[PDB]
Paper text:
Due to the amphipathic property, S1P cannot diffuse freely but has to be transported across the cell membrane through active transport. Among these transporters, Spns2 is the first identified and the most extensively studied.
Here, we determined the WT Spns2 structure (named Spns2wt, without PGS fusion) bound with the inhibitor 16d (IC50 = 1.93 μM) using cryo-EM at an overall resolution of 3.5 Å. Moreover, we could only measure its inhibition for S1P transport in the cell-based efflux assay when we overexpressed Spns2 without adding exogenous Sph in the medium. We speculated that the high concentration of exogenous S1P will cover up the Spns2 inhibition by 16d, consistent with the reported weak binding efficacy.
Numbering used by the authors: 96 to 284, 299 to 539
Write the structure that this text describes.
Amino acid sequence: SLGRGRGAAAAILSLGNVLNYLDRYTVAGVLLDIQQHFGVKDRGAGLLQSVFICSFMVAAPIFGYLGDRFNRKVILSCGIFFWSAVTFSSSFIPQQYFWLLVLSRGLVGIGEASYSTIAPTIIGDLFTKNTRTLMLSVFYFAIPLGSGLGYITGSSVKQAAGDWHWALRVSPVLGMITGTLILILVPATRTSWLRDMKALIRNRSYVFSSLATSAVSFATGALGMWIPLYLHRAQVVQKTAETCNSPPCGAKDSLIFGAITCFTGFLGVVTGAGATRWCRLKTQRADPLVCAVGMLGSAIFICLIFVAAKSSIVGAYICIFVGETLLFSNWAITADILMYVVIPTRRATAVALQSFTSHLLGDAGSPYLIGFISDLIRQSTKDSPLWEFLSLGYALMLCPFVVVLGGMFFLATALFFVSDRARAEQQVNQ
Ligand SMILES: CCCCCCCCCCc1ccc(-c2noc(CCCN)n2)cc1
């Protein structure tokens, strides 16, 4: 009935999503200064993101529940105000205390989980059909954009202000403004869990696809959480004796990584769509096959980046470009597979299930696992920047391995995709 209001609501929701991801990844951008100032080792650095993801995983379903039974717009505004306040207050934590930052991360994760679980429901309720899917697409466009802007803002504010605290002191004002706008312009708005559990435990292609998504989450969490620090360590190790005065400044690598991520999000989605469209003419199980090929390519390039980074950095940058492109090529394809195999009646429930699983074996403790392994290698050898480099590299060498199992699981679901799709088709429509 009204177009301007719906358009403004979509715009403010998309801006809120951008802000959400920016606040999510600013800490990953600025972790080096935090680690240096607080005097902690890689264990706590991983623990930050691990606690964030754990809080998000725990708090998503209850927030969704409160969303469908109670009012959504007020809950959305309360959540954005909550994580904005916690983010602003986190910058004032003194050096002598560390667990304060971790609990602040947990509260921020709670707020972001509320926002992420709530907003798609209203953004899809407002519109319908082609308009709805276009609006959902422009909504989800915020992820590769949001992560990149988070890296960019963290690095830029660190470089300009000269102290890392201000990295958390530029976003909350935008958060409060976005809360006021979402309150002003936006118009106001399970069953048989046991049976769905029992039915879905027997869907083998569903299980294999969920495991593949878990492996992808593991890889992307570890990479997007640890790569800038590894690059900085490599740069300083090269600078040990290449010039003896070359700037090892960290404000030149995080920006490049952020811009690269913004590019590869869209690039990988586009190339995955093109590849699946091309390959659907040959066979019927082309989607898991192209997912598996993308996983194999990503594993290959993630293998050679950790070797190329020893000598040349531009080689590492192009390798990571190709790696994240081929890694993100399967985003929409996984959801398409899930849409195709699962019966409509439990469909939504199934989706939620996958999220839970993808947040348990994926990025729940993956950054902490990498930190733990790097620390274990550290204590067994000497302490030196060169050994910092090799220890972090050896710890991070675990990602292509799990990517290889992800590709194998996509092959496994490829074998049974046709049979499961046929069974789903026969069951529906009677
Ligand atoms: C280092 C930067 C890492 C940045 C990635 C962080 C991922 C966290 C959230 C997980 C996630 C991702 C993508 C999608 C999705 N994309 O498209 C569609 C359907 C479109 C139909 N035409 N669904 C859903 C959920």
